[PDB]
Design a protein around this ligand. Structure first.
Ligand SMILES: OC[C@H]1O[C@@H](O[C@H]2[C@H](O)[C@@H](O)[C@@H](O)O[C@@H]2CO)[C@H](O)[C@@H](O)[C@H]1O
Ligand SMILES: [Cl-]
Ligand SMILES: [Hg+2]
Ligand SMILES: [Hg+2]
Ligand SMILES: [Hg+2]
Ligand SMILES: [Hg+2]
Ligand SMILES: [Hg+2]
Length: 265
C-alpha cells in the first residue's frame, strides 16, 4: 500500500522535449538508465520516504584496504542516501581498525568480522554493494533504488560488445559469445532489493564453484559472472558512469554532468 504524495510544485515534464539528447536513458527492456537530468529527486525522495525505506550499504575491507574506510564512510555521510535510513555493513578482518566515523541521525554501522544473511531481509529494504577504495563526491540517492541494478563500467560504456572483456571461453559458466551482451557492468557497484541481491550473489557463488571444479577461472572473476547474470536477468535500472568513475584515468567528459562515486588516487 503506497500512500498518496503531497501537493508539490515543480516544472511540468514536457512530452515533446527529450530528457537528454546525448545519451540513451532507457534500455530496450524499458529499464531507466540513470543520468543527471533524468530524475526529479524531490519527487523520488517523497516516494521513498513515505515508504520509510532503509538502505543497506555493504563493503569489504580486508588487510590494507581498511585504510580506505575513513574517507569512504565520511563521504558517504555527505552524499549517500542523505535523509533516508541507512545501515552500513563493514566486513573486515580488522574490527579494531575500523575508524570511528560520526554518523548523521537515522544512520548506523555494523562491523562484521570475517553473519546470518537472513538478517539483511529483516533489517533493510535495499542492499547496495560497493568497493571500499572509493569516495563519494556528489549525490547518490534513491534514484538508484529498484529490484535489481547494475552500473556501466567507466572504461566500456562507449564500446561495442565485441570489445567487452566478457569471459570468452565456452568452458566457463560466465561465457558470453561475441554476438551477445547489452553492456559491460562493473562489479564494483550493484544492488537492488535484498531478495534480488541475494539471488545474484548466490548465482555467482554457484557458478564460480562450478568453474573451479572444472579447473577454470573467469577472466575477471566475480565481475565476469556478474555480467553473465545481468545478461540473462536484465536489471530493472542501469546506472550511468556518473556512479562509478576514475577522473585520473578518464578525465571529465562533457557527457558526465556529475561525478558521484570515484576511485581514490
Ligand atoms: O576489463 C575489465 C577490468 O577493467 C579494469 O580497468 C581497466 C580497463 O579494463 C582497461 O581497458 C583500461 O581502461 O585500464 C583500466 C584500469 O586498469 C578494472 O580495473 C578491472 O577491475 C576489470 O573491471
Ligand atoms: Cl561489492
Ligand atoms: Hg529530462
Ligand atoms: Hg543464516
Ligand atoms: Hg552485498
Ligand atoms: Hg561470486
Ligand atoms: Hg556476482
Amino acid at each position: 500500500f503506497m500512500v498518496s504524495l503531497p501537493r508539490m510544485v515543480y516544472p511540468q515534464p514536457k512530452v515533446l522535449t527529450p530528457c537528454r539528447k546525448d545519451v540513451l536513458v532507457v534500455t530496450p527492456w524499458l529499464a531507466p538508465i540513470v543520468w543527471e537530468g533524468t530524475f526529479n529527486i524531490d519527487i523520488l525522495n517523497e516516494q521513498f520516504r513515505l515508504q520509510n525505506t532503509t538502505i543497506g550499504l555493504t563493503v569489504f575491507a580486508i588487510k590494507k584496504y581498511v585504510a580506505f574506510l575513513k574517507l569512504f564512510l565520511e563521504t558517504a555521510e555527505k552524499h549517500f542516501m542523505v535523509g533516508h535510513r541507512v545501515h552500513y555493513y563493514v566486513f573486515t578482518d580488522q574490527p579494531a581498525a575500523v575508524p570511528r566515523v560520526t554518523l548523521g541521525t537515522g544512520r548506523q554501522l555494523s562491523v562484521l568480522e570475517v553473519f546470518c544473511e537472513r538478517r539483511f531481509l529483516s533489517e533493510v529494504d535495499y542492499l547496495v554493494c560497493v568497493d571500499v577504495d572509493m569516495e563519494f563526491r556528489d549525490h547518490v540517492g534513491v534514484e538508484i533504488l529498484t529490484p535489481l541494478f547494475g552500473t556501466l563500467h567507466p572504461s566500456f560504456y562507449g564500446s561495442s560488445r565485441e570489445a567487452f572483456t566478457y569471459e570468452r571461453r565456452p568452458q566457463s559458466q560466465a561465457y558470453i559469445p561475441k554476438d551477445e551482451g547489452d553492456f559491460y557492468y562493473m562489479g564494483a557497484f550493484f544492488g537492488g532489493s535484498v531478495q534480488e541481491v541475494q539471488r545474484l550473489t548466490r548465482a555467482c557463488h554457484q557458478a564460480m564453484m562450478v568453474d573451479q571444479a572444472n579447473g577454470i577461472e573467469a577472466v575477471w572473476h566475480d565481475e565476469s559472472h556478474l555480467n553473465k547474470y545481468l545478461l540473462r536477468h536484465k536489471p530493472t535500472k542501469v546506472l550511468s558512469p556518473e556512479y562509478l568513475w576514475d577522473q585520473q584515468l578518464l578525465g571529465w567528459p562533457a557527457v558526465l554532468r556529475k561525478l558521484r562515486f570515484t576511485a581514490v588516487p
